[PDB]
Design a protein around this nucleic acid. Structure first.
Length: 56
RNA sequence: AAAUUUUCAGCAAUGGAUGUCUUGGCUCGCGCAACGAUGAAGGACGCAGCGAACUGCGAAACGCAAUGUGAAUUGCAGAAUUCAGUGAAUCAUCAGAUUUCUGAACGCAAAUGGCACCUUGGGGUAUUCUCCUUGGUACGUCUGUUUCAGUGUCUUU
């Protein structure tokens, strides 16, 4: 059984001398949206060393 | 005679008829031929500076690029620069892009973001380890290719 080897590429990101490679879908920024700030969340930051964030 | 009941008128109440409107319907006629494995129709969940819906859109999310028009949008806010301009707009046009999870729906599934394997590129005593990361692996069918099986018919080394 031969592995695939599909002659000519499907999508043009992955080619010889492409040089504009694909920018990422999930960056670090789109994971970690924003911190929470509330009465409940700010109590933790002092005492238990603990940050709260809203994430994807 | 009051009061009450009934009747007629005036004013007030209750109610939404009549009249006048109408960016909607209905019917007739005339043109045009253009959905989908290059992922359709339909579904789900999201996205606005301040939105629930309805329209619009898809992590590039009431939009981006291009072209045309050439100064707004508007409920408030802000931005004022964008103002003899390589340029305002819930503008028109639209030939370039994005297009989550789905669905014929396609790795197995399914009241489950469940359970696999292969693969690219990188991250942490290891060829077998775990991790992030890129893209794959359904069915039928045609032409070609490669690898086979059959004391099928034949020669024969």
């Amino acid at each position: 059984r031969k592995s695939r080897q599909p002659k000519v590429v499907r999508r043009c990101y992955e080619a010889a001398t492409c040089t504009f490679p694909k920018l990422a879908k999930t960056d670090k920024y789109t994971i970690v949206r924003q911190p929470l700030t509330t009465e409940s969340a700010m109590k933790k930051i002092e005492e238990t060393n603990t940050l709260v964030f809203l994430v994807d």
